[PDB]
Amino acid sequence: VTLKESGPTLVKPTQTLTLTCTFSGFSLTTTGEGVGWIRQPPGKALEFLAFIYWNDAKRYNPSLQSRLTITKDASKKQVVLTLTNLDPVDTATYYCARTSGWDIEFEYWGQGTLVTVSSGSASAPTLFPLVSCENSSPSSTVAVGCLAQDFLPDSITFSWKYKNNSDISSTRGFPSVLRGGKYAATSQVLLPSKDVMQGTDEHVVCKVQHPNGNKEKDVPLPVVI
Amino acid sequence: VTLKESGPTLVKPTQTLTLTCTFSGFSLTTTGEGVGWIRQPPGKALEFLAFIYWNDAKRYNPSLQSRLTITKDASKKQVVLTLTNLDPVDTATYYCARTSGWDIEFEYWGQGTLVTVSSGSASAPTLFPLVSCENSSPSSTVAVGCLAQDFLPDSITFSWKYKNNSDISSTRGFPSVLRGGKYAATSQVLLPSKDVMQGTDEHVVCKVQHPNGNKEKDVPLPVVI
Amino acid sequence: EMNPNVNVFVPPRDGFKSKLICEATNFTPKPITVSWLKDGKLVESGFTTDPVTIEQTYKVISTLTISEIDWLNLNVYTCRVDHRGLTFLKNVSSTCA
Amino acid sequence: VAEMNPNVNVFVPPRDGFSGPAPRKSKLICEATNFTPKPITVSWLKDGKLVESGFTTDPVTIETPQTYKVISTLTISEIDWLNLNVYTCRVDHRGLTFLKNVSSTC
Amino acid sequence: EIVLTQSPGTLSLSPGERATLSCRASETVSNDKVAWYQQKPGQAPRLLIYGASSRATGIPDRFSGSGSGTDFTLSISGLEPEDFVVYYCQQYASSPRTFGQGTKVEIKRTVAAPSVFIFPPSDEQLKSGTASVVCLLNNFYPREAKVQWKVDNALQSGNSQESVTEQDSKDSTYSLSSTLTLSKADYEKHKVYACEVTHQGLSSPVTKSFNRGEC
Amino acid sequence: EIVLTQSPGTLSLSPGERATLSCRASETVSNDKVAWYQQKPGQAPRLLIYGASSRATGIPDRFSGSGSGTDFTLSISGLEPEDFVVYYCQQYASSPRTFGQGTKVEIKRTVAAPSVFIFPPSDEQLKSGTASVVCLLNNFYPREAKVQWKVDNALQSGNSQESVTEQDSKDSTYSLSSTLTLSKADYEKHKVYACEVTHQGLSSPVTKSFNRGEC
């Protein structure tokens, strides 16, 4: 038993949102079996939208009543969900699950899909150099960052390389935050102070792999010594 | 209500030991009241010797039966304890207490007295200089000591003074240990590193206040620099 | 970025083996390399470099072991300082000569 | 483990050791090596007059008997050197005084 | 409408110990139809126990449920590193059903002093009319920390979102980033920008600042 | 003969927390006639609770007793620095009575690296025919520590008494002294004397030794 979701990755506010829950291996003929939709905004808990039983029996949440519609098609074996009056605060990942009886609820879960509701467009990410202004305190090591801004949807992987195209193990990944209709994220890397006062390499390259452009700006080290 | 003990401070092994528990302020006439002896070797727990009730009713420990005797004298209002077959392992401080009824046991305790059972005599303490052979590691601070040996009974106080008769706060006092029929102890002192490598004073005096002699040997400083 | 000052000290005229001290002061950044030369030939042994100390300015001192006979032989000793891609050479000799 | 008398060595600039705006200035180095105890007092004398300014003494650092080294630097003027002035490094060691005399005379 | 509240929000446990999760309901649930779910960040939630007393297929026996009515407790014996995830309690006797807030369990560790670094906005970014000042905190414990922005002795408010990372897999520490957003014209009217960091393991607060034009 | 065993022997508590002392009896005690005593080094022991449920005159109400039969627990609320002494449980229903081993409570503190110093015997002491080599450990925690003597790669045994001081009033640390005793003739047959100190806060053991004739 497995479930797969599908739908648009970007929808404008105050529009129509449609999602399809693709399942195969069972039929909604026996009693007790049902399909439900659960969403979870980032940093929040699960939210119950609606649930539909057999014999075309559907239930809706009073907090969201007269705003959602549940339709099923036995021919294609997939439930169709329609969402109207899209709001930016309603952005979340939608999951569907199968209930195998009356007591075993949501035994099998799918994978879900991120549905971002932003008035803006999927523009290319913008990088900005970061110069360390630390002074009078070298401390253990020095750090340099990279500010990836104005990206949508949030799917970015960070990799750090030296001037000679080396490999760096940073693993410092900060989650994105919705600010002014756009997602913003920051990434840093820790480098030893000895290397700064040594090799002639005075800068490193910041690389981001986003499906809107393959730009890669370089962040120059401030050098303290 | 208070109790006071008295007896010899030094007794030879395989002899007769006598102790007196002096109390004043009550009489052993009411029921429930009784007197008992509890000893505690250094580093060990309390040990019960015997207990005597009213109407000349006495109880003895089976582990020490036929070895102790309990006698009371209402004229002097003090219980007399007799100990035979003295053994060095039996050295401990003996306490007596009053029981104020059947449930309140040992409500008031006295002060006790140290009864040392050693085959040797109360000889004057012997001091031996101690020079630290530490090398290649001065560390934060260094310490020097004074070996007070061959003393009996164990009652020694340590004071450290410079050449100009200054004052030092050591507060480091190690308990004495019975080794070969005699008590052995060591005392150290903590001094700042800078002061040691400074003044021309190359020696200090080790002072002990024991009631067998007022000797005071001087320990020459090894000098750091 | 300021060029380091190169100074070489010589043994006293009236006698003292001895040592040669080359001092570079008021230089930036901290890293600096100091070497010694003998009659235009590279020196492979007999010289040591002390750790750089802070006098922002830094100070570096180097010590070269020499013999009395070699110094009096009018041999030319040169202290080589490399800093920011620049090389400074200072030549000294006997004053009374 | 042992006590050794300190060694006094004085370094003087050569004839071409003066630079900078007129009047030119130089430095004098007095160093003691393989000496004990570690504390040491370094004083400079100029024609019998004690020098109380223009000198900087580096902290004593470690260079089997323990050894230590001390470096002292005194600022001098070219004019004073040309007047055949004699500079003496004063070393105090357990109440003993060691003096070394240097001059530009050949 | 059944309101489900879970407390405490964050609890620090050690491996091998016992963890007890509390689930509070606003009213009695018919037939004690309460179930527990396990959710890991990135992946999808998985069902563990249905009906608060019967485990599901592929669930270890170390998970035990007890209680009835309005009080439910989830006890887990032999805590594992992989079990440090968020857990939710949900009841299916409401129709429509409701979900609880959820509780997060973290690995207990010692207090480590954080590192504070501030990067002034770049000259190129200033040309876009937006200035971003960052305040980075790394290697601190516990996750609870206060980050306040102070510029020209004036405390800022209502202009900090605050982003915090998850627990490190190999270090068990936490990291968070604070971004300062202000107009370009307002940026030129201020000289010194500083963010104050307060930590349990620090005797006194440490403040870092920079001077405009020197970086 | 009623055997009383108390465990654990040594426990580390913090001020303000709750401390629970366990008292185990080898058999049931008639009428639950069990009493607790408090003893401070130097001074005399003082009675606290008689009958395991009734406090005595001049005893604070923060001491509470509970249990019956063969299980007794002593709970103290609001632990004070002056309360870090040895406590004994005793029953008076035996006739003759017996005393337990007792438990010692210490103030919890962080681990501090100890300092190791060895003093070779003086020349004057050697003239008496007895040589005493000492091994000093200062400022270490916890009290548990291993001190082993190794001379000429031969481990010694059966010749070390070992003396340990009490907890410091202002430092809360512990110190102990180990003395090595050997014959004068045997002393001249060995060259290097060293004592090994093992501590929880040290990554590797530290060994100190000296050469005969150089000190």
Ligand SMILES: *[C@@H]1O[C@H](CO)[C@@H](O[C@@H]2O[C@H](CO)[C@@H](O)[C@H](O)[C@H]2NC(C)=O)[C@H](O)[C@H]1NC(C)=O
């Ligand atoms: C690229 O240059 C860097 C210099 O910043 C090299 O890093 C040095 O080389 C060693 C060996 O690879 C590294 O492990 C150290 O980080 C650096 N050395 C020291 C002494 O710190 C790096 O190796 C270069 N890349 C390649 C592929 O050679």
Ligand SMILES: *[C@@H]1O[C@H](CO)[C@@H](O[C@@H]2O[C@H](CO)[C@@H](O)[C@H](O)[C@H]2NC(C)=O)[C@H](O)[C@H]1NC(C)=O
């Ligand atoms: C006795 O001599 C000692 C020298 O070791 C004096 O100790 C010095 O004097 C100050 C002031 O008393 C002390 O605090 C320092 O420990 C020592 N000074 C330095 C610079 O190390 C001590 O004071 C003398 N006693 C008296 C009473 O004067």
